[PDB]
Structure 1
Amino acid sequence: EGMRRPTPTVYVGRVPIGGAHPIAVQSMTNTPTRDVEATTAQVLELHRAGSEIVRLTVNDEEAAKAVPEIKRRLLAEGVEVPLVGDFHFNGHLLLRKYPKMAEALDKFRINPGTLGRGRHKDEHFAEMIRIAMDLGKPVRIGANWGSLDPALLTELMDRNASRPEPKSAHEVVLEALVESAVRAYEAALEMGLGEDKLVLSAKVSKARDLVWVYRELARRTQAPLHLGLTEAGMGVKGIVASAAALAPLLLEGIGDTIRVSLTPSPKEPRTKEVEVAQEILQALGLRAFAPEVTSCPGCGRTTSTFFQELAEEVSRRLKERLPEWRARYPGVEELKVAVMGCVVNGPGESKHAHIGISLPGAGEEPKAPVYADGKLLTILKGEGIAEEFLRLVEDYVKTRFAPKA
């Protein structure tokens, strides 16, 4: 905001993807697809966490047979989340053999590096595109440098070698990835697949490379782009790498749906990737999913236990109130609340939030000004400052986000 790269709109089920539409969050299950109970449950969990589209692997016949049942069960729950089928090597076979699965999916993902080789590859690709066209389904053509077509790389390495100034092998691999996606995009369009039925991706695992790749894809094609840093890994590394890779592109207006490719720790839920995706988009002002807290790090000017506990309590309370607030108070997802440690940046940061509190740091009288809408609202003192503040936030929301219209 802004400006978005303009693109045609591609509907993935009821969710529109493209330049005129909010950037969508999506995620992918990790249960065996043949396990209908486990996969249905996880799709629900991911959707409830904020995944607007959910992808599942459709890797073998047993998975393919399961898809119509999963979709049936989701619909029985009144949940219309679009499902993307992830196909590799035998997608043409499964789509051919299981038309009920083909119809149940809301989008097909093809990888131009896992279609086979030679004219087998061309025919496999054409069959899947033909099936999509016949059913009116959209397709993501998704290249990944982990599965890059070796024949194409060879072609480009030779082209490069003849150049007056040849590029490194690494630059050529990135070129080939882009070329793999662009050639398949152009082929699909030439076969009759609509511009309203084509999404592209070309993922790599390092941020700097990803920025290069998606700038090229954005320039060379008109399609909405599925953006993600592939194989981002574990823990803080996976979170940081993902945000670092996506933000430069998103700030330039590139990307129409995102997925965060975290490796879960055994103890953490699959939904973490959805939480990260939401935070990336909200950090950049591109979506508003829920209220957020701006808080200083705290330093020697404030008492650490009190301040850290206050900031945590405020974050926890906003999370708890949200289901009620969403129902009563349109627009509350945009709420910004500040919790600040001392007079140095307290009042100023608080006056930039919708409502904020500045605690007394060292050398200050034990009172805590509260600011709302850019000016002083009141001053709190004594015990229970946390609870008094949260009541003020509650009152603030009731008034600022009152419905009607």
Structure 2
Amino acid sequence: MRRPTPTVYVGRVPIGGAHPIAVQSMTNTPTRDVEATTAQVLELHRAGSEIVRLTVNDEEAAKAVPEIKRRLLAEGAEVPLVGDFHFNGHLLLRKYPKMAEALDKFRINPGTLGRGRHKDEHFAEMIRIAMDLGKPVRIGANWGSLDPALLTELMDRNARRPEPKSAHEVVLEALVESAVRAYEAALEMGLGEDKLVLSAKVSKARDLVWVYRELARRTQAPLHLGLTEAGMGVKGIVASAAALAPLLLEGIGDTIRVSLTPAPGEPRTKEVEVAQEILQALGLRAFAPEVTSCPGCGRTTSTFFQELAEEVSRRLKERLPEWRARYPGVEELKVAVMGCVVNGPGESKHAHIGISLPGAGEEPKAPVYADGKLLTILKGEGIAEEFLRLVEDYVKTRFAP
């Protein structure tokens, strides 16, 4: 069901309907701080951010970008950099051509170009520079910065309707129109279809689904999908997954970014982890082995079961760097850890390998299944260590080169 699109290369990373959905992220360090920004770019890339965006907000930020890129290259890190421009993007790209050349993509917001007539000039200048340098561009609209003139135009169109739509609905129409008009304008100026990505972000999940369905229908471009301003903690994680899934399941979206607010002291890499989990939950990409486990109920002994599931998950995460190097395809591994006979055997049989613990009323033994059939039955002390040895043995055989 994947929506076909042309391919847009962001550095070495291809984005589009023929390619895996790419995970990206954005730094939160001051871009002018070269050491801090370089470190975080590397951190995010190592966590799985295939593309990294950084704000290029003033002259000091712009002068730093070439040095950041140089440092990344010096350690063989080929992570593409997207420059986020607002208000003065045309001035910065004009004045600092080394920055323009160092970036792998430019982000333009059609709502932060300036006022009235100046918008069109500023937009054209940035597209001109991208064309001269062979750079791709994201035209990214956001409802936090919606073009007010376009909003009035569409409010007037709506008022003329036999049955006018709500103000809220018109805001969404205008956001879509902002992206689509700027898309069409960039194409008319000669920027190639292989150099244009679009986004039109809102902060409410049901609205995001409406917007992206319209974008997908009305344009041919690959789409950068995300729920903007998703927020903190569990709310942010849930809202982001809830917003993206209906679209990704329908085949809409070519790159994603999860816009979480970090808690103080929480790593910026959390958003990368969440993005990966969304794609893997929907079977669109595989990044690491996953554990299926039941919630546990009154049929299990809660703490032993919870401890085993946690220990198995912890070991898989410890083994992954090595496994990824030795065992191609191991990212697809499914392990089950289950609490009793009700669903334990059946769920374990659906995993590559799973263990079903004895619950209430059962004999104190734990069947282990692999590839849908009984492998062995464990008992006594060290169930956990015996199981993890069996998982290691399984991986060696199943995912051998």
Aligned to 1:328: 326
Q: Give, in whole Å, the separation in 2 of the partners of 1:51 and 1:185.
A: 26
Cα deviation for residue 52 of structure 1 reads 0.2
Cα deviation for residue 101 of structure 1 reads 0.1
Count matched residues.
401
Runs of at least 4 residues off by over 2 Å: none
Cα deviation for residue 119 of structure 1 reads 1.6
Cα deviation for residue 100 of structure 1 reads 0.1
Q: Give, in whole Å, the separation in 1 of the partners of 2:58 and 2:230.
A: 26
Q: Give, in whole Å, the separation in 1 of the partners of 2:165 and 2:303.
A: 55
- Give CA deviations for 1:346-371 in whole Å, capped at 9, x if unaligned: 00000000000000001000000000
What SS does the aligned partner of 1:192 have? coil
Greater shift after overlay, 116-125 or 177-186? 116-125
Cα deviation for residue 284 of structure 1 reads 0.2
Q: Give, in whole Å, the separation in 1 of the partners of 2:361 and 2:322.
A: 40
Q: Give, in whole Å, the separation in 1 of the partners of 2:293 and 2:374.
A: 18
Q: Give, in whole Å, the separation in 2 of the partners of 1:389 and 1:219.
A: 50
Q: Give, in whole Å, the separation in 1 of the partners of 2:219 and 2:163.
A: 26
Cα deviation for residue 327 of structure 1 reads 1.0
Structure 2 counterparts to residues 55-204 of structure 1, below 5 A: 55-204=53-202
What SS does the aligned partner of 2:345 have? helix
Aligned to 1:315: 313
Q: Give, in whole Å, the separation in 2 of the partners of 1:248 and 1:163.
A: 30
Q: Give, in whole Å, the separation in 2 of the partners of 1:304 and 1:267.
A: 31
Cα deviation for residue 155 of structure 1 reads 0.3
**Residue 4 of structure 1, aligned match among 2, 12, 17:** 2
Cα deviation for residue 267 of structure 1 reads 2.3
Percent identity (aligned): 99
- Give CA deviations for 1:173-216 in whole Å, capped at 9, x if unaligned: 00000000000000000000000000000000000000000000
Q: Give, in whole Å, the separation in 1 of the partners of 2:345 and 2:11.
A: 46
Q: Give, in whole Å, the separation in 2 of the partners of 1:113 and 1:127.
A: 16
User: Normalization by structure 2: what TM-score?
Assistant: 1.00
Q: Give, in whole Å, the separation in 2 of the partners of 1:239 and 1:285.
A: 18
Q: Give, in whole Å, the separation in 2 of the partners of 1:132 and 1:268.
A: 35
What SS does the aligned partner of 1:356 have? strand
- Give CA deviations for 1:11-42 in whole Å, capped at 9, x if unaligned: 00000000000000000000000000000000
What SS does the aligned partner of 1:258 have? strand
Cα deviation for residue 57 of structure 1 reads 0.1
Q: Give, in whole Å, the separation in 2 of the partners of 1:21 and 1:203.
A: 22
Cα deviation for residue 131 of structure 1 reads 0.2
Aligned to 2:205: 207
- Give CA deviations for 1:268-304 in whole Å, capped at 9, x if unaligned: 1000000000000000000000000000000110011
Aligned to 1:265: 263
Q: Give, in whole Å, the separation in 2 of the partners of 1:281 and 1:96.
A: 38
What SS does the aligned partner of 1:393 have? helix
- Give CA deviations for 1:53-76 in whole Å, capped at 9, x if unaligned: 000000000000000000000000
- Give CA deviations for 1:103-128 in whole Å, capped at 9, x if unaligned: 00000000000000222100000000
- Give CA deviations for 1:289-321 in whole Å, capped at 9, x if unaligned: 000000000011001110000000000000000
- Give CA deviations for 1:123-181 in whole Å, capped at 9, x if unaligned: 00000000000000000000000000000000000000001111000000000000000
Q: Give, in whole Å, the separation in 1 of the partners of 2:60 and 2:281.
A: 41
What SS does the aligned partner of 2:77 have? coil
Q: Give, in whole Å, the separation in 1 of the partners of 2:294 and 2:70.
A: 48
Q: Give, in whole Å, the separation in 2 of the partners of 1:210 and 1:115.
A: 23
- Give CA deviations for 1:58-101 in whole Å, capped at 9, x if unaligned: 00000000000000000001100000000000000000000000
Cα deviation for residue 381 of structure 1 reads 0.4
What SS does the aligned partner of 2:336 have? strand
Q: Give, in whole Å, the separation in 2 of the partners of 1:323 and 1:115.
A: 44
Q: Give, in whole Å, the separation in 2 of the partners of 1:163 and 1:114.
A: 29
Q: Give, in whole Å, the separation in 2 of the partners of 1:34 and 1:311.
A: 44
Q: Give, in whole Å, the separation in 2 of the partners of 1:232 and 1:140.
A: 20
Aligned to 1:295: 293
What SS does the aligned partner of 2:261 have? coil
Aligned to 1:367: 365
Which ranges of structure 1 fall in alignment gaps of 5 or more residues? none
Structure 2 counterparts to residues 17-36 of structure 1, below 5 A: 17-36=15-34
Q: Give, in whole Å, the separation in 2 of the partners of 1:377 and 1:5.
A: 42
Aligned to 1:50: 48
What SS does the aligned partner of 1:275 have? helix
Q: Give, in whole Å, the separation in 1 of the partners of 2:230 and 2:317.
A: 27
What SS does the aligned partner of 1:181 have? helix
Q: Give, in whole Å, the separation in 2 of the partners of 1:299 and 1:24.
A: 38
Q: Give, in whole Å, the separation in 2 of the partners of 1:95 and 1:337.
A: 50
What SS does the aligned partner of 2:377 have? strand
Q: Give, in whole Å, the separation in 2 of the partners of 1:252 and 1:328.
A: 34
Q: Give, in whole Å, the separation in 1 of the partners of 2:45 and 2:51.
A: 8
What SS does the aligned partner of 2:235 have? helix
Cα root mean square deviation, aligned: 0.4
